[PDB]
């Protein structure tokens, strides 16, 4: 009959990355987590203890508890037509600080600058982000660059 155990279908998922087996480097252990931090989740197959279920692989959540060897991460999983709160107990080997926040955090500081920076001069800022605009006009020269004319080419076999 069918089979649906805890680590089922996870053959390649928890595998270890080519020529990256063995001890986990100590920086993993030196990193620090605080309640409220955002972390991305990804299982280290060599660390069987305190391991996320496969569902949570590649999922990103917020730290809510800090314990001796682990952090508690809340993840919102959607079941049926709705989300339920889930709290995971992950060991530090299966978690890393998310960068999903840097382009913001680095942009916030930046915003504060050119906000005060400008203001002091005499305003006129504009610091919302804007999408790729279309291209403006432009003139392209021919100097040293007369257009090369190509045609399509006949069918041929080489084999």
């Amino acid at each position: 009959g069918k089979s649906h155990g805890y680590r089922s279908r996870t053959r390649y998922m928890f595998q270890r990355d080519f020529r990256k087996h063995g001890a986990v480097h100590l920086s993993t252990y030196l990193k620090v987590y605080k309640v409220g931090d955002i972390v991305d989740i990804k299982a280290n197959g060599s660390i069987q203890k305190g391991m996320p279920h496969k569902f949570y692989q590649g999922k990103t959540g917020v730290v809510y508890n800090v314990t001796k060897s682990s952090v508690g991460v809340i993840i919102n999983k959607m079941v049926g037509n709705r989300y339920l709160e889930k709290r995971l107990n992950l060991r530090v080997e299966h978690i890393k600080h998310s960068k999903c926040r840097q382009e913001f955090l680095e942009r916030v500081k930046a915003n504060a600058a050119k906000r005060a920076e400008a203001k002091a001069q005499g305003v006129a800022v504009q610091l919302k982000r804007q999408p790729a605009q279309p291209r403006e006009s432009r003139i392209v020269s021919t100097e040293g660059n007369v257009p090369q004319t190509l045609a399509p080419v006949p069918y041929e076999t080489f084999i």
């Binding site: 959607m78 037509n81 709705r82 989300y83 709160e85």
Partner: protein, 58 residues
Amino acid sequence: AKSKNHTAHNQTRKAHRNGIKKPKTYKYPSLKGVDPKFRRNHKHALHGTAKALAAAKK
């Protein structure tokens, strides 16, 4: 007497009538399952700072 065994057909139609409700989010979430040693202390800490505002309204 065999029959259809299983299908997801029409299930996301259904999930989407009333919607996939985005998670709902609160300031001050629960401390459910947070380290009991921490909480015990956090409890007296709060007792303390509260005292020192009742005190600052003397």
